[PDB]
Design a binder for this molecule. Sequence first.
Ligand SMILES: [K+]
Ligand SMILES: [K+]
Ligand SMILES: [K+]
Ligand SMILES: [K+]
Ligand SMILES: [Mg+2]
Ligand SMILES: [Mg+2]
Ligand SMILES: [Mg+2]
Ligand SMILES: [Mg+2]
Ligand SMILES: [Mg+2]
Ligand SMILES: [Mg+2]
Ligand SMILES: [Mg+2]
Ligand SMILES: [Mg+2]
Ligand SMILES: [Mg+2]
Ligand SMILES: [Mg+2]
Ligand SMILES: [Mg+2]
Ligand SMILES: [Mg+2]
Ligand SMILES: [Mg+2]
Ligand SMILES: [Mg+2]
Ligand SMILES: [Mg+2]
Ligand SMILES: [Mg+2]
Ligand SMILES: [Mg+2]
Ligand SMILES: [Mg+2]
Ligand SMILES: [Mg+2]
Ligand SMILES: [Mg+2]
Ligand SMILES: [Mg+2]
Ligand SMILES: [Zn+2]
Lengths: 201, 307, 98, 46, 183
Amino acid sequence: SKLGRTPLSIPPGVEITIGEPFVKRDMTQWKQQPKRKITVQGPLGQLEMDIPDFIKIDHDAEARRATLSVANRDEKEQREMWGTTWAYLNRFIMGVSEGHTAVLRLVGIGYRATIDTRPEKEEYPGQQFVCLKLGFSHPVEMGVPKGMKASTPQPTRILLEGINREQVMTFAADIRRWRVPEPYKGKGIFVNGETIKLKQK
Amino acid sequence: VKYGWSTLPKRSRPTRFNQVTQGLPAPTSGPAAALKRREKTTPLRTGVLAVKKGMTVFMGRTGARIPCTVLQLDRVQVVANKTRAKNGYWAVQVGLGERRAENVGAPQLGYYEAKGIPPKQTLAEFKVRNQDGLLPVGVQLFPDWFHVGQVVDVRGITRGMGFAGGMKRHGFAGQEASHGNSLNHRTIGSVGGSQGSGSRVLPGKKMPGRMGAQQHTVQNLPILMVDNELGIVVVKGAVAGHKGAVVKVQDAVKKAPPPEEFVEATKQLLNERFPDAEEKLQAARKLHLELKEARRQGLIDSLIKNG
Amino acid sequence: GGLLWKIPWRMSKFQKLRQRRRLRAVDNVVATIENALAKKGETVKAVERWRAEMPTEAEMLPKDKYTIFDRKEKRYRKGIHKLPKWTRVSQRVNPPGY
Amino acid sequence: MKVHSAIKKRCEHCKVVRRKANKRQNGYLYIICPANPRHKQRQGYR
Amino acid sequence: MSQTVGATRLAYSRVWHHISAVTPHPTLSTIKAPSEAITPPSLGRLASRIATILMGKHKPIWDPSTDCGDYVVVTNCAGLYTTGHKKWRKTYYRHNTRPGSLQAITMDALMEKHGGAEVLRKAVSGMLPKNRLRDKRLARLKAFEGDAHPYKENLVRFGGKVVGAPGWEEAVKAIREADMERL
RNA sequence: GUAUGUCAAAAGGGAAACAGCCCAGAACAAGAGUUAAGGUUCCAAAAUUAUUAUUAAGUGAAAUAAAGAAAGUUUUUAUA
RNA sequence: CAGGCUAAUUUGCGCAAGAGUGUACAAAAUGAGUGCGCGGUUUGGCACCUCCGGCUUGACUAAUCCUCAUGGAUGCAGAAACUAUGUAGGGUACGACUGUUCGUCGAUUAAAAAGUUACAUGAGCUGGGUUAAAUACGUCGUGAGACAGUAUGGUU
RNA sequence: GUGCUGAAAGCAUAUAGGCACGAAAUUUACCUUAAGAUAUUUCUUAAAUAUACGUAAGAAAAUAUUACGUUAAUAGGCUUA
Ligand SMILES: [K+]
Ligand SMILES: [K+]
Ligand SMILES: [K+]
Ligand SMILES: [K+]
Ligand SMILES: [Mg+2]
Ligand SMILES: [Mg+2]
Ligand SMILES: [Mg+2]
Ligand SMILES: [Mg+2]
Ligand SMILES: [Mg+2]
Ligand SMILES: [Mg+2]
Ligand SMILES: [Mg+2]
Ligand SMILES: [Mg+2]
Ligand SMILES: [Mg+2]
Ligand SMILES: [Mg+2]
Ligand SMILES: [Mg+2]
Ligand SMILES: [Mg+2]
Ligand SMILES: [Mg+2]
Ligand SMILES: [Mg+2]
Ligand SMILES: [Mg+2]
Ligand SMILES: [Mg+2]
Ligand SMILES: [Mg+2]
Ligand SMILES: [Mg+2]
Ligand SMILES: [Mg+2]
Ligand SMILES: [Mg+2]
Ligand SMILES: [Mg+2]
Ligand SMILES: [Zn+2]
């Protein structure tokens, strides 16, 4: 992969900690493949993932860089996870330092949004609940997963924040699942600059 | 196989050796998995045994007229508790009525001897959700066990109808009456296809046979009246069986359990009406050993004529 | 048809091995007869015809040992085990191009 | 969506992908097109 | 007739063998190199070896009529090895003779109810002769999901070392050397 | 109709079961005898025997469903 | 007659290709004459085997009339409907006409869809059609008589 | 059918890998029958128990099933409402 070769510039403040090849015994499997626990701690938080053992990280603390490599480029399994493991570390490094954000735009007459607390259905103490008026008879209320900070600068604009991109973009898709953009009036929830082509009439 | 997908012998007992604490996946079958899938629908409290006394109507003070059945509780007592560590499921055994000692057998005479309860007429188990549903042994359950407006389920044995035909047993339409029919006015007709359908009567074919005298449940029957003195619990609707038959009454499974406050109030009333249900039980269990040890030795006659 | 003649369209690795040994055994019968005559300075017209227009098992293509030419087939080829008495009959040459 | 036995790209934006393939089924071949939704096609039957 | 005149007691005795469905088997594995790639015995390749033990065909006194089989304790059946996508694509069918009542279930759904031991009993069952000894032989297959079983004292031993243990082979060679000190 | 064979009047081994196909012509026994067709993980006598490639679909494994489609994969031949 | 083999044929379907229709624009819908197939429902072929509807009671199939989820729809504003992908759990009624399956019609309905099983089921029933002896009409035959012609009746 | 992350393939991609939504079908749940492990600080040393017989029945073609048999309201009679 042409992306796995590119070094990963570790900006000041971020710290990458590579574990050791370990195997969690699984009674359902006769042989588990070793993995490596990689922690990426920094100002905003800490993210952890387990990479296959065939991926080798040359963590250069001097130049603050870390290049990836596989034990065999001829195997399809190792070529794929090489680039996928790089794309994840890139997000982790750029998520714990700067952070990931998603913007949702509510188009449609009568579409509002507020961030209130619903102590009745709190999954964890202090859970924030996004309350959305989307034209349904009932109120649509969703609790932000633990680790995300949601705010609404304007009634028709939501701003999600978090260090885990996969979690942030996944939670923005659940909110969008209630009102998918329509092609006749543009009403719906658009995520991160998403647009829809309109019809003539 | 013999039953299901299991080819395991019938005398093998390997359950204790396949544990989830050893890293194995929780089985989908077995007592543990059964109780989880029925956790929501299992009642929280126990039930009572009542005798169907007849049918009537409940007249409201504003014009209402509601058909209902009168179920009388006769000396209903808690006889035993079934724990999950000793039996595999939660349940409470309840008794009804009385019986003459001579009719009761020695196996059952000693069963009640170790409890301090007079021999009962019938016994039945009522499954409960968890250990909180177990009650002290020897406490009587009165009609106030339920509250007016509470929905329950009534289980009873239907009226026996002997050998029934096809019309009464399976609602077969029958055949014509006068347009040429020969000897086939109430018969079942054809019983299947020919060679292409197996050359045999197919299993599960609806045919004449005995009808009735089987258990039937009526679900979601409210409680209109609750009278402790009369000992009756009036429920709306009909109930299976004949008058004088024993039925099982318990909270509905398809409805939310009664309020938490009620479940505690009823349990708190059993501690007042019977302030000592354990002291009388431990004394009975202490006497059973003394008499059981005398029967073994053969000196029971001395104890009988001791005073 | 309703009468079942369950003959597979292809041969097994066992039938192919014995077919190779039956072709190679008929090569030794023709070489033994041809060498025994050469010592006496004699020749047979049938032995000279065979060596001319018939190949040996080592000169045959895999498709010529296990298949024959049938004009009623999609690709003008038919399993050699479909020939009557194929085990005791000689068959090594097919029309050119097919 | 049009379920054909011969799926073909109808523009430069059409892509050939094999989706719904998992441990229980082999999946189908799809012609996904973000420009025109009328180019959606599938090969195979459930 | 001399060869069979003697004490046949121990030739007909039931031996309690043991095997783990997770331990790599260099003999019953199709991957024989490298050492780290040697897999355990597959379902059908383990079942074919077990059916041979249940029939007593590994003995020189085997007779199909006499039930000279042995016991086999198979452990770690939860990690039963399988290739391809058998676990989620193989189906087990059942019929009770009543039209409509065909019951199908996948290998993974059959391992959630009765564990991997049932999948192994079905394989060994179909590899046994279809006769009046099929249920007796299949009953001597005691398969368990984990490492725990009630036959840890029944397993055949040699000098205190259970067969298949780390040092069972050396314990056997030490007993036969003393056997040679006799006429 | 023709050519050839079998059955008919031919048992036995193989083709799951089999009048007609592949082997082979049964007077009767004995044998880890020697072989044909066919086969050798288990049912079930005999290889879980060796060498090199392909397939990941249980395709297939003793009765080939077609034209056709396609960033499935391998190899060869050009070519950047 | 039914079963068996076959599949020209069909009132049973599918896929490939795309003349053309669609104001525009091939594939929303539509699809000439064709090609490659599946299937065993119609009308047939062969000659291996043995010298009709209705009622009652089912079972199964899915190529779907309704009900549930859903893609496409210059031709999806909504609603209704069209086309297609999942899906056979339940339902698919009543009446007039005809011996009728079929077909036509009336009025309701969410809808009033099909097929296999000896075109399921007559040692379960019905016998109206069909199918003997009687009799008449028409037609044919010199005549006795005949008729995939029609009528009344005719031991299930 | 609809998604998030995301490479092989710098792009793209709900294709590999890691997660998710989603139907009157399925499974569970609900009801009946069958199954009969198990439980009781249960009984029994020639018994426990069951049957037979008699009055019956919530049972009923036979059978079976559920009660009772004088220390007894099982059936009939009688008395009252
Ligand atoms: K009559
Ligand atoms: K029969
Ligand atoms: K994407
Ligand atoms: K139940
Ligand atoms: Mg009665
Ligand atoms: Mg009637
Ligand atoms: Mg049969
Ligand atoms: Mg046949
Ligand atoms: Mg898809
Ligand atoms: Mg003759
Ligand atoms: Mg023969
Ligand atoms: Mg075979
Ligand atoms: Mg030999
Ligand atoms: Mg063998
Ligand atoms: Mg196959
Ligand atoms: Mg749409
Ligand atoms: Mg359902
Ligand atoms: Mg018929
Ligand atoms: Mg008949
Ligand atoms: Mg008359
Ligand atoms: Mg990407
Ligand atoms: Mg005891
Ligand atoms: Mg006695
Ligand atoms: Mg009687
Ligand atoms: Mg009286
Ligand atoms: Zn396109």
